Amino acid sequence: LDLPDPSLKNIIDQTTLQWVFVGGKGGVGKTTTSCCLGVQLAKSRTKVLLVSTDPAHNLSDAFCQKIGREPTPIHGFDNLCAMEIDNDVFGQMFNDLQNSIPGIDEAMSFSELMKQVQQLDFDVVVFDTAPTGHTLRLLSFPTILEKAFAKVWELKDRFGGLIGQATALMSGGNNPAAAQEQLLGKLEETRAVINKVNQAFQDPTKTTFVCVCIPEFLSIYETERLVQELSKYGIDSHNIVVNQVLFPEKDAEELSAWYEANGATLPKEAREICSKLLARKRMQDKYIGQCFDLYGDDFHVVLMPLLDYEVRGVEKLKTFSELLVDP
Amino acid sequence: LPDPSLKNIIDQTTLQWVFVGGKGGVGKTTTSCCLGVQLAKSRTKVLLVSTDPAHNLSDAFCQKIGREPTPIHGFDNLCAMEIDNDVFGQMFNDLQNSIPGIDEAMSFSELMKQVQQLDFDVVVFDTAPTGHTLRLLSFPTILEKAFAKVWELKDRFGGLIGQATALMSGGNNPAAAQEQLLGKLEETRAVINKVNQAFQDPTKTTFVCVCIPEFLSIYETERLVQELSKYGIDSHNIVVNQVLFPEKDAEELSAWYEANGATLPKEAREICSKLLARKRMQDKYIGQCFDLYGDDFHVVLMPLLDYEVRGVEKLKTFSELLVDP
Ligand SMILES: Nc1ncnc2c1ncn2[C@@H]1O[C@H](COP(=O)(O)OP(=O)(O)O)[C@@H](O)[C@H]1O
Ligand SMILES: Nc1ncnc2c1ncn2[C@@H]1O[C@H](COP(=O)(O)OP(=O)(O)O)[C@@H](O)[C@H]1O
Ligand SMILES: [Mg+2]
Ligand SMILES: [Mg+2]
Numbered sequence: 001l002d003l004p005d006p007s008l009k010n011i012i013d014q015t016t017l018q019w020v021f022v023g024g025k026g027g028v029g030k031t032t033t034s035c036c037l038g039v040q041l042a043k044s045r046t047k048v049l050l051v052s053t054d055p056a057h058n059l060s061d062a063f064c065q066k067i068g069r070e071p072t073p074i075h076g077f078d079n080l081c082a083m084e085i086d087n088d089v090f091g092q093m094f095n096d097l098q099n100s101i102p103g104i105d106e107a108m109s110f111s112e113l114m115k116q117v118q119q120l121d122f123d124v125v126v127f128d129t130a131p132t133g134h135t136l137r138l139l140s141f142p143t144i145l146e147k148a149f150a151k152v153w154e155l156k157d158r159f160g161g162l163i164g165q166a167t168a169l170m171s172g173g174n175n176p177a178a179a180q181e182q183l184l185g186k187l188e189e190t191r192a193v194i195n196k197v198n199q200a201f202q203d204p205t206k207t208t209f210v211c212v213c214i215p216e217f218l219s220i221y222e223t224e225r226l227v228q229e230l231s232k233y234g235i236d237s238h239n240i241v242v243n244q245v246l247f248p249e250k251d252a253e254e255l256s257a258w259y260e261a262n263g264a265t266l267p268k269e270a271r272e273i274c275s276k277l278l279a280r281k282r283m284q285d286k287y288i289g290q291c292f293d294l295y296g297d298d299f300h301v302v303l304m305p306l307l308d309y310e311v312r313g314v315e316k317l318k319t320f321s322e323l324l325v326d327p
Numbered sequence: 328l329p330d331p332s333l334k335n336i337i338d339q340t341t342l343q344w345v346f347v348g349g350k351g352g353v354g355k356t357t358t359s360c361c362l363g364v365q366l367a368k369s370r371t372k373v374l375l376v377s378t379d380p381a382h383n384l385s386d387a388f389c390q391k392i393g394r395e396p397t398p399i400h401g402f403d404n405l406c407a408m409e410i411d412n413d414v415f416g417q418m419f420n421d422l423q424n425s426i427p428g429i430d431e432a433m434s435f436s437e438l439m440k441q442v443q444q445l446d447f448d449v450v451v452f453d454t455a456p457t458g459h460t461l462r463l464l465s466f467p468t469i470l471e472k473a474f475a476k477v478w479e480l481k482d483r484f485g486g487l488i489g490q491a492t493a494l495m496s497g498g499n500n501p502a503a504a505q506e507q508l509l510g511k512l513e514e515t516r517a518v519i520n521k522v523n524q525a526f527q528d529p530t531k532t533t534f535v536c537v538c539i540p541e542f543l544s545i546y547e548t549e550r551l552v553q554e555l556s557k558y559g560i561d562s563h564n565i566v567v568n569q570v571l572f573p574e575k576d577a578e579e580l581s582a583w584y585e586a587n588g589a590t591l592p593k594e595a596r597e598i599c600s601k602l603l604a605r606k607r608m609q610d611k612y613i614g615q616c617f618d619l620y621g622d623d624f625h626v627v628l629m630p631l632l633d634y635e636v637r638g639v640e641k642l643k644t645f646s647e648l649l650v651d652p
Contacts (some may be wrong), residue, residue: 016370025417091602096550099458102427131431162619166542169611176542217491217501220415224486225421225480225488290487 004300007323008210008239013041016205019125021235024212025222026131028303029243031058032311033212034128036321039314041124042080049122050082054130059084064313071120076314081122085113089170090179093155097183099150103137103144108186110138111193118197132222139233142198145191152184202234209237213291214244215284220291227295240295241302241324242288248303251291252281302327329625333362333535333564334650337369341530346452347539348460350547354629356383357636358537359453361646366449367405375407375449378438381457384409384419389638396445401639406447421480422508426473432466433511436518441524447598457547464558467523470516477512478544481505493650527559530575534562538616539569540609552620565624567616570609573628577606627652 004010011020020041022034031054038050049071052059059082060067063074071081098105117125131134137144156163163176170176201207209230213219230237259278263271266310288303295301304323311320336345345366347359356379363375374396384392384407388399396406423430442450454460481488481525492502526532534555538544548565555562582596584603588596613628620626628649638643 014488015542087543089543092546096458096547099462133421158553159546159549162546165615166546169608170542174542176546216412217487217495218412218414221487221501222417224484228483247418275350283494290490294487301443 003296004238006038006253006300006302007325007327008037008241008300008302010300011037011208011239012044012325014205014208015044015210017124019127019201019207021127021129021135021207021209021224022212022239023129023132023135023209025219028212028214028219029241029311030131030212030321031062031128032317033210033241033243033324034126035059035062036315036324037210038074038082038126039077039239039317039321040325041126042077045079045123046080048081049117049120049125050080050128051113051117052082052084052128054087054128057084059128062312064235073245074314082115087174089174089176090182093176093179093183094186096155097148097151101144101148103140104148106137107141107144107194108190110141111190111197113199114193114197129257132226136229137227139229139235141194142191145187145194148187149184149191152180152187156180185203204236207235209235209241209249210239210241211237212241212243215242215287215291217287220287224294238299239302240291240299241304242291243304244306245288245303246277246281246284246306248305252278252285255281328621329563331627332624332650332652333365333566333625333627335625336362336533336535336564337365337650339533340369342449342533343531344450344452344533346454346460346525346534347537348454348457348534348551349566350539350544351456353537353539353544354566355379355537356453357642357645358535358566358568358649359451360384360387360642361649362535363405363407363451364402364642364646365485365650366451367402370448371404372447373405374442374445374450375405375453376404376438376450377409377453378435378440379453382409384453387637387642399639414499414501415507418477418480418508418580419511422473422476425476426469428462428469429473430467431462432469432473432519433515434517435463435466436522439522440518457551460551461554464554464560465568467516467519470512470519474509474512474516477505477509487587529561532560533564534560535564535566536562537566537568540567540571540612540616542612545612545619549619552558563624565616565620566627566629567613568629569631570613570628571602571606571631577603577610580606 018138020037022030022037024030031052034050034052038048042048051061057067063082065071065075067082067084069083069085071083074080074082113196129138163180166176179200190312209226211223211226213223227237259274263274266274291301302324309316311317336342345362347355347362349355356377359375359377365374375384382392388407390400391397392407392409394408394410396408399405399407481504486507488501492500495501495642534551536548536551552562558583580599580603584599588600591599613639616626627649629645634641636642
């Protein structure tokens with residue numbers, strides 16, 4: 001067959017990329033893939049930043065080094081930084097909006113993060129995103145903002161009488177109408193930031209998504225959810241990383257023939273372990289064929305081997321990254 | 328105008344659920360406990376349920392209150408209660424991430440089922456602050472949206488789900504897990520449909536809105552009243568709590584102070600001026616309350632006291648003021 005190269009080298013080749021998002025469900029290897037992409041990009045690019053919005057602090061455990069809320073340089077690199085991230089009328093109206101429109105706080109946090117990152121001045125940013133479910137809401141942010149605007153408008157419409165009647169009483173910093181206009185302005189600031197950011201995100205020159213999974217149903221199902229959602233929102237993805245593949249080198253036909261020929265020559269325990277490993281290989285192959293049915297025409301499908309050790313520490317990450325970019 | 332008491336709540340012997348709402352700190356818990364104490368007289372069995380996040384019921388009654396009906400010391404028929412790989416788990420987590428509030432709707436569904444099977448004559452609900460109670464009102468919409476989401480996912484990924492069902496044998500069937508999630512949504516929706524049908528019946532359900540003579544409290548009260556009206560839920564009782572001497576009008580003390588202020592020692596002068604300023608402000612907001620309501624609502628004015636209304640006797644005296652002024 002001829003197909004895209006089964007590596008992430010196309011990411012390194014596209015030198016114009018400014019945002020690389022790494023997605024997938026929990027435990028498939030998002031953080032490892034992100035760290036390896038950062039290590040590889042640090043070669044050609046002037047400055048590379050890794051941002052983790054996954055709730056835990058997995059970045060520190062990955063690099064075996066404490067990572068701060070602001071760009072922490074990585075030991076062994078000069079141009080690789082990492083960063084991990086977790087009376088008053090206006091206050092009441094803002095609280096009411098937060099309770100009414102779930103997700104507006106996430107949108108404002110993401111807006112603030114984008115402002116801070118875009119002012120940090122880096123050549124490329126790799127985002128270790130949260131598990132798929134949370135990233136899908138991240139994608140829905142424009143709808144969340146539109147509903148928040150509609151709520152504030154409905155609120156003005158429905159309670160203008162009370163708000164105007166109260167404006168005459170309370171002096172100083174508690175004019176209700178001014179508080180409503182200020183809440184509109186904060187929503188407007190958030191929406192403008194997110195619109196500029198989304199314009200950059202819909203440009204395949206600057207932004208692409210790497211989807212990580214493992215050869216099991218739930219991982220591939222969440223990958224398909226993410227791929228379709230990204231396509232819906234015009235965000236480019238052309239890389240699937242299938243992680244933790246049980247020895248991708250050898251073929252199930254080959255080892256099945258060997259086992260059917262030579263199983264009874266093995267002690268019972270070795271025979272049982274070989275049989276279990278073969279069944280696991282067959283199942284994984286079923287799911288990898290499913291991946292190539294869904295993708296492969298339009299995606300670089302990278303197969304990564306299951307290792308005995310956790311991929312922590314700089315040297316391990318470098319070896320894994322080399323497997324990632326040229327197998 | 329309607330009588331300035333909550334006696335109409337006691338008179339309507341058909342009431343099954345009385346919800347008490349309002350902003351934080353306005354007196355929801357106090358009013359709920361007092362309504363329960365008063366209802367325990369006419370009704371055979373009365374239950375107080377607290378969905379307020381904190382454990383304020385225990386502090387109110389000065390007694391630890393349990394997760395299931397705890398009888399109240401001094402009462403024979405008044406109980407209170409305070410309230411806190413895997414394909415199915417993954418799909419439910421996806422739904423929780425997609426439809427925020429579905430878990431709250433299911434928790435409320437289970438709570439309502441348990442309450443309806445405890446079989447009480449009347450239940451008084453001390454709700455959480457207004458913002459959360461409004462979402463409670465939106466729960467049926469959230470359930471419909473969750474159903475629609477699971478069906479959209481079923482439609483779009485049926486191919487993948489069935490192809491994986493063919494692979495993994497025995498249990499952990501993804502299609503069965505999706506049908507199981509639909510069935511759990513259906514259970515929840517049936518409970519909440521019964522509950523909402525009871526909520527829209529003024530014979531069985533009414534809302535008491537608590538506020539204080541301040542702008543924000545009245546604003547949240549108006550939000551709550553309009554939301555209840557949208558959803559066909561009855562409210563005809565406003566409790567304005569912590570009123571600074573509700574009997575007298577600020578006019579009298581204003582005339583007295585403007586005449587005789589400088590003849591007072593410094594401390595008396597200062598406290599009198601502070602009290603007068605607060606009373607003037609409170610009177611503006613109480614006039615606002617009577618503008619908004621009073622035509623259609625029983626407006627109960629309750630005095631601000633020096634002590635916190637904790638303990639059974641405090642609750643009894645406050646309840647007497649609440650139902651017969
Ligand atoms: N190819 C692999 N083989 C063996 N273990 C791996 C592999 N890739 C990642 N791991 C380990 O699995 C754990 C989960 O990986 P991580 O990148 O944290 O996943 P995620 O970020 O998607 O939750 C990590 O401790 C990592 O060391
Ligand atoms: N009329 C009143 N005078 C003085 N204190 C009061 C009055 N009503 C309530 N309190 C006190 O104010 C506090 C808040 O009341 P609570 O019923 O807990 O409000 P909510 O439940 O709405 O937050 C309680 O400690 C209560 O004892
Ligand atoms: Mg991660
Ligand atoms: Mg309370």
